[PDB]
Amino acid sequence: NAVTHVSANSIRQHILFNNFETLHKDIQSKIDLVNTFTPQTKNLIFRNLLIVITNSYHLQNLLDALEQLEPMYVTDAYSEAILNEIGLCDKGIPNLSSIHFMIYLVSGLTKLTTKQSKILMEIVTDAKIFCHHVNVLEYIIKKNVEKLETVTSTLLEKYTKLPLEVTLFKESGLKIQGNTYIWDPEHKKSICNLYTVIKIMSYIM
């Protein structure tokens, strides 16, 4: 079941996201950027970010510090540690690639809802389950990202054997009951932002 869906809001989000290959190449370009970090840097960033996302206020100040190159704006020691690691600090030199990467990832995280941030904290404790969320969402996006339509469809039964916290997807506008979902292009930016965040996080965990 599909119906053409043209509003200004669906058009905007279709201009941003209409081609899975392009989206996936953009994500790969951020992941190869991660491959420039040492494992201790990746570890420090990943673990500190999981604490920062417990408080939207501190996460916003981290984003402002990154975007304005102004370490004075952070309001917590976990964000401060991130800035110290990438050189945005006294006696540091801010590393251009790392700043760009962190702006991208932190901006994506500020778009999550409180419930999504709480779920992310839960699912990161099991890498198989975390990756399963990534894989299921990737499949839905690959199937629907080119469509300027509201689509009702089902997941392959093979994608339903490991557990999911489907509220993670519902908070981005992907309605789900059982194995059936409704893809609405008015929520495409939220869904693709969520996928970009969890795809990238899976590579730093």
Numbering used by the authors: 13 to 217
The article reads:
Viruses acquire host genes via horizontal gene transfer and can express them to manipulate host biology during infections. Some viral and host homologs retain sequence identity, but evolutionary divergence can obscure host origins. We used structural modeling to compare vaccinia virus proteins with metazoan proteomes. We identified vaccinia A47L as a homolog of gasdermins, the executioners of pyroptosis.
An X-ray crystal structure of A47 confirmed this homology and cell-based assays revealed that A47 inhibits pyroptosis. Our findings demonstrate the potential of structural homology screens to reveal genes that viruses capture from hosts and repurpose to benefit viral fitness.
